[PDB]
Design a protein around this ligand. Structure first.
Ligand SMILES: Nc1nc2c(ncn2[C@@H]2O[C@H](COP(=O)(O)OP(=O)(O)CP(=O)(O)O)[C@@H](O)[C@H]2O)c(=O)[nH]1
Lengths: 79, 468
RNA sequence: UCUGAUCGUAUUGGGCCUCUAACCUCGGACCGUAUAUCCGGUUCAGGGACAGUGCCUGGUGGGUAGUUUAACUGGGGCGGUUGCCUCCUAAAAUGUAACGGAGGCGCCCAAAGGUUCCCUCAACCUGGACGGCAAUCAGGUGUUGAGUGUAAGUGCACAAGGGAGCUUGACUGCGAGACGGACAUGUCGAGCAGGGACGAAAGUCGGGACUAGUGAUCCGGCACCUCUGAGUGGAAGGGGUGUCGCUCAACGGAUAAAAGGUACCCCGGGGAUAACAGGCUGAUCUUCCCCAAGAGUCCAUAUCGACGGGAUGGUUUGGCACCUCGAUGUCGGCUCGUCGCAUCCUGGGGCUGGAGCAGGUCCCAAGGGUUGGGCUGUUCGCCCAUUAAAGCGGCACGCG
RNA sequence: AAAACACAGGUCCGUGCGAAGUCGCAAGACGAUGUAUACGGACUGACGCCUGCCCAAGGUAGCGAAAUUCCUUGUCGGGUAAGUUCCGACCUGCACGAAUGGCGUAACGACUUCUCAACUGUCUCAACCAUAGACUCGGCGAAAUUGCACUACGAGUAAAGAUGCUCGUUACGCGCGGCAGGACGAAAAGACCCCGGGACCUUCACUACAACUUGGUAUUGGUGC
RNA sequence: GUCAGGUAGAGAAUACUAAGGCGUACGAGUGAACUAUGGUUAAGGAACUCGGCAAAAUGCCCCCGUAACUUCGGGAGAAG
RNA sequence: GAGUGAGAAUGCAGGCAUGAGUAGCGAUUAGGCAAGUGAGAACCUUGCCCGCCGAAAGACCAAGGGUUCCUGGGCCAGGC
RNA sequence: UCUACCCAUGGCCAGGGUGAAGCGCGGGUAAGACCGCGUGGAGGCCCGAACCCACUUAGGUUGAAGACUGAGGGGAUGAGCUGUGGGUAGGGGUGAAAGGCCAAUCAAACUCCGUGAUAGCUGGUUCUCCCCGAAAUGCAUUUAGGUGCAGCGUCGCAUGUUUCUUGCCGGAGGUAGAGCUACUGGAUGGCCGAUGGGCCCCACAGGGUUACUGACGUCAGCCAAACUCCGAAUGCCGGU
RNA sequence: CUGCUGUGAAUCUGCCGGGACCACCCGGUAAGCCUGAAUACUUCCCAGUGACCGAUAGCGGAUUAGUACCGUGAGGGAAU
RNA sequence: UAUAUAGGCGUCUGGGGGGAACGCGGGGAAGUGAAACAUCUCAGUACCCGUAGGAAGAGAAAACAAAAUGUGAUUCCGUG
């Protein structure tokens, strides 16, 4: 009475790695995603696998534009 | 062990005139009403039949397939085609002739098929030999006979006795095809249900484990033991009253239930099928002048009565052996009504052999008058022996069936003249209401008459019986 | 010696026939010898460069030996899996088991890659020769329902979908800083230089819309290098760079190389794990009930009562694996019991399709009783002859 | 303790003779002080029975029967009140199986399974009698077992079967002779099942070796083609 | 391994005895159940039981008479 | 500086409990009395009687044992 | 020295039956074969003690005894039983073959040695007080009752509130719920309606039609882990 | 550097080694011998030593000790 | 059988067996470790055979070394 099922895949730890208002260094990953759940705005770039990474030191921000959630890096002012 | 293997090469199995790979496969069977055999989904199994020509000829040759096609349709699956062979010798392996296994596999693959039938009980191996070759669900005459009763089952009595018959038919072939059926199971719904066939109970299967099968046969046998007591308790009043009873004995589809509806105003079910009425049902009726007698139907009797299913017909057999006058209904469809009647009558012989009381008086009738004898004319009405028939395939009038039935029923009621005086204000009322009032030669005052009376009224008026 | 047949003489191998001196004979006769079927010696008779033995070498070889013969597993076997990818389970961060529910992968593409530029489908409506429901064409409606090489999902109409021009970035030398993480693995990466592609430039290009398409180390192969070079110069070998060889698929990969029997078994352990027994559940089973379609001669409920529904008992078949494997001895029979009543007889009642004789069903009732035999291991059941009856069950399927 | 081994009988195979075979590294030994009417191995296991036209090339050529029992195929009766083993006439068309395996077989058997006659305490169904223990008295005088102790019962609870816990019931202290229902009684670190290790056995598992066999070369030479 | 009395017997079986040697090493009681070993059992006669297990029964000598089958030997002590 | 700390290993050596003054006291033959001996007598000595074996349980030979044979003395171990 | 078989040399088997060959006589005959009678005394012959073995049953079963006793049993002139003396020795022997026996053990005897074999297995591990104080999870495993690394303990060292709770603020989510005329499915009853059929004219073209069907669509009510136009509460990530 | 089986050299411009091999250099001069000291061990004997045991320890053996005793034998083997 | 030898006769000198360890030469395991196992390790240990000596074995470069004007038999210790 064998079972045809039983297989699965590994833990691709997707999800947002830096949330709103979080201070980031350049190059850091912001979301690991499959597809285009999020888009890039200002100072945000897309990697090979639809990853989103910072392009300047700053603070993360999540907004929307034209109907698609986008991630931006607002430049923190030096106090 | 393997000798010259050129048998279907040059040799002929039983080719006296027409055999040995001939597989006439004539009479493609099948029938269409308004098309839409299913109307949404797989409501037909596209079955195929089989027949083995034996003693007899065209008189019966096609008769088997004619009966089987109708029976399979009743089960509710389109019969694609039939296939027989002259078959001088019934081969115990598959009794099919020259073992044309590849040939029948190919002619069933050429057709949608996916279901096959047979004629007669098949031994476990006697059917496996074809299961292997065909690679399709195969169920023989007795399997379908039982499935019909299962589908039509209505009450506890039937749902138990048909269940027992099915278990005991499995008993000799618990190995092989039963496991083959269970392997893929019904698969939503199978071609052979269980205790009730038409969905509902019996949805799972018939035989799955030998232990459970034996257990359930034991329980079922005890249940029928219980039902015998219940039935004989119910059947008290008639035997306690000595009330004449008659039985409608018809082969099948002979309009027994419809005839009962007629002549008695009964409203019993009359469905198009070879096994419609499940248990013998009865009703009180009146003869020409009175005699509040009883009339009962019988359950269908098909050629080669499967002995694997007798618990169902046991009640019917009892109800026919505990009766006086028998009326034999036939169906005017086949070409050999003589064969129909002789076959169905072959059973009363063993009935009386077992429960010997006497050969009951006999009468004949054949329904379907409107549609029957379309090319028969009144030969069967004049030249043929005792028979009366006016019922139509839906219903008609009854003219002398109710007269000769009374004249041939037990005439135990004494007809000796008795003298009834005036005496009380309405003393004659007792006789008027009891013993009929035949020949009410009412005169005057102390009215003098002549009428029949039963044993107690005769003995009560004995002293007053002054000759005319 | 260069372009080169045949030459004269001397050095040699094989096949075949022989010979005797190597060697062989448990064939004979003599001597050591008085005894000796030993042994050696002389000689005669047969073989004979064979055979046998030494070193080397290819086959046959359980005759014998050393061993291997995986794990998961609602006990074990049998069956079925074993790595990677996607979804649900998965409880709105990540993650999360089950022999839980579905599927794919062990590739493909020299363009289906890079870049520049342009376009918008499916479906529907109306009209048109073949041509139709569906081909190509015209108009309109048509914001995503078509398609996206390949599983599913995340996305894609800003197009990642559809066309075309040119190209090879399917680069070399790197890499701030991060994700994931037992470790080893695994993913992302702006930007700098060299030399290119596309484009007027800005710019994009370190393979494919993303996520599977793979295998550590060892050992060895193949090309190049300002390496090394066992006294010295070389070379052999080694080293670096780049790459190559594993259904090592049991996919973190014991060996380069491996199946089975044991009731002839044995040892170390285990109630971590089974068979009997107890325990929980009650699917199955037994005891009934609820509703009443129908049957029962008319008449649901004298007697039954389908399709459906609710439970009791813990005796059957099972599920679980909680005690017991440093021992709880299995069935049937015999002896001895004791108990429940769901009563077989005897006792008291109701109803009756109870005239009487009897019967059916229900209620109360456990005091006592409930046979002997033939076959059947038979769990058990069939038969014989009686009786008022030859009851059903629990107690480690009571009691070794 | 037998149906098993053996056995006389039979049929193959090896062996031409310090044979073949076996023990031994070898010498050597047995086989044999024997010689194919013998020796060694291998199966079977007295004795009898098993069937014709083709069968310097005639053709399908497998007999095509039997003494055939899987043959509960009710396919009937005898065996008795009810009878298992069986006994006989039927369904028993590849059935089946046997050219070397099957049928028969007188005699025999502490073999297996049944029926009859006689006989009986085997039984219905038990009673009595004697002896040897038991029992009492005198002498000597162990043993296994043993966490403990002035060690009840019911219903419960608990590692789910309670002398030992809870709540109730019952029971004056101490012995003697008996029964065997408990102490999951004693006995043997369960022989069953699983796990790990082992052993021995099998083989077309792996890898070796003994042994056998094939060739090169040394022993090993001469003359002729 | 050797000797082998007498009677009844075929007998070296069995019984009782001669010669010879022993009473061999815990006893004395006691009608307990129960166990072992013997004995007997009315009437039935395998009903017991998985199974005639055990026990019972026949058993010697002399005269008659001895079947089916058979390898012609037997069977055979047939059996009676 | 340690052979340094035991209540368990079905641990090992010695001593001693419980069962318990309990089972058993070893074949299918059998002993009794009188008298003696002696502190002490069922068991020893003598006399009688009774019983057992008698193809041995009698009498020899070999193997094996090794002084167990006989006389005197003794009786705390052994003799169930 | 037991036991398996073999070798050398001895011994033993009470008593009683049947009666084969051979030989003689007589018949049968050419003829023998064959038939009766006599001596004769063969036989893995018969009955049965000694002797040997071990079929049944009871007893014993901390036994009288580590294999016996009682009572019946089988062989008992033969492949017989037995004494004395020898031979075959372990991966070897012997085996009328049971894996039987080889000194109370044999699917490879005994003793000593290698040796204090090894055992992922079971048992054992001895005096006290104080402080702290777990895990039964993840991954991998010829792996699952073992082990390595991480997690969770303790101790020393370094920093020091970075820990944690509460408030407020900034975040992504697609669960609970809910919704479907917003997607993919199934489905409940109506409404209109192509296919229509069958019917009235009758063409077949052209008009009505027709207990009826559902193409599309419409109304009302539904539901879904692998449906979502939406969508909380907690949790989580930072800041304060 | 060596053991077995084949084959098989030159005597100094000779021959071997210098980590495959080749040339130059360098070191030696095979196929012949003998040779103490430095070094390993205690059957035995003599003189001492011990943050060694002290009668269940220390040798199995403080007393009959390889004794009694067990086994056919090798062999095991105490207590006081 | 002729030379001669084998062999025979006599006479002289030696060996033979034992011993705790250590020496030299030669055969040479497996348990075990590798978490299995075969190479491998165990380990040239155990055991065995031959053979002595008070010690043995090896010993006088056909050696090392590396261009150093090198050291100068063997043995055994300590480093490396
Ligand atoms: N011949 C006949 N047929 C009839 C009559 N009335 C009806 N029928 C048709 O016959 C069919 C079968 O019903 P019927 O023959 O009465 O069944 P039955 O023979 O009484 C009982 P069963 O069907 O089991 O044999 C029905 O479908 C019905 O339409 C009649 O009077 N005579």
């Amino acid at each position: 009475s064998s079972s045809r099922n039983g297989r699965d895949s590994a833990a691709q730890r997707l999800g947002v790695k830096r949330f709103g208002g979080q201070v980031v260094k350049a190059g850091e990953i912001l979301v690991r995603q499959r597809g285009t759940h999020f888009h890039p705005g200002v100072n945000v770039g897309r990697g090979g696998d639809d990853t989103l990474f910072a392009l300047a030191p700053g603070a993360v921000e999540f907004g929307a534009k034209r109907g698609r959630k986008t991630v931006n890096i607002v430049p923190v002012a030096r106090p | 062990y393997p000798e010259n293997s050129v048998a279907p090469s040059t040799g002929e199995l039983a080719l006296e005139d027409r055999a040995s790979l001939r597989r006439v496969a004539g009479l493609s069977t099948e029938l269409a009403d308004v098309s839409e055999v299913e109307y949404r989904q797989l409501r037909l199994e596209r079955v195929v039949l089989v027949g083995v020509w034996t003693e007899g000829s065209a008189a019966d040759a096609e008769a088997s397939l004619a009966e089987l096609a109708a029976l399979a349709e009743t089960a509710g699956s389109e019969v694609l085609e039939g296939l027989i062979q002259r078959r001088d010798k019934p081969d115990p392996s598959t009794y099919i002739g020259s073992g044309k296994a590849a040939e029948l596999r190919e002619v069933v693959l050429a057709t949608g098929a996916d279901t096959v039938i047979c004629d007669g009980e098949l031994s476990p191996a006697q059917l496996n030999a074809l299961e292997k070759a065909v690679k399709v669900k195969v169920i023989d005459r007795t399997a379908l006979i039982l499935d019909i009763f299962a589908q039509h089952a209505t009450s506890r009595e039937g749902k138990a006795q048909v269940s027992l018959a099915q278990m005991e038919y499995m008993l000799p072939r618990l190995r092989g095809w039963g496991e083959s059926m269970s392997r893929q199971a019904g698969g939503r719904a199978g071609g052979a249900g269980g205790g009730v066939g038409t969905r509902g109970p019996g949805e799972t299967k018939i035989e799955t484990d030998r232990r459970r099968i034996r257990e359930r046969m034991a329980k079922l046998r005890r249940e029928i033991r219980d039902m015998k007591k219940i039935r004989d308790t119910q059947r008290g009043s008639r035997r306690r009253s000595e009330i004449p009873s008659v039985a409608i004995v018809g082969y099948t589809n002979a309009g027994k239930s419809s005839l009962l509806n007629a002549l008695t105003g009964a409203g019993v079910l009359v469905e198009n099928a070879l096994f419609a009425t499940l248990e013998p049902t009865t009703r009180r009726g009146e003869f020409e002048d009175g005699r509040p007698f009883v009339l009962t139907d019988t359950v269908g009797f098909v050629r080669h009565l499967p002995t694997q299913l007798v618990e169902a017909f046991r009640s019917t057999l009892e109800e026919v052996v505990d009766a006086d006058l028998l009326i034999h209904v036939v169906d005017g469809s086949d070409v050999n009504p003589l064969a129909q009647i002789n076959a169905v009558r072959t059973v009363i012989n063993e009935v009386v052999a077992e429960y010997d009381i006497a050969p009951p008086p006999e009468l004949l009738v054949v329904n379907k008058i409107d549609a029957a004898t379309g090319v028969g004319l009144a030969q069967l009405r004049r030249a043929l022996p005792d028979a009366v028939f006016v019922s139509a395939r839906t219903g008609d009038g009854l003219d002398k069936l109710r007269s000769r039935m009374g004249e041939l029923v037990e005439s135990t009621d004494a007809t000796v003249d008795v003298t009834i005086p005036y005496d009380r204000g309405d003393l004659v009322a007792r006789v008027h209401t009891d013993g009929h009032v035949d020949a009410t030669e009412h005169t005057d005052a102390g009215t003098r008459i002549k009428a029949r009376v039963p044993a107690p009224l005769a003995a009560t008026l004995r002293e007053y019986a002054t000759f005319a």
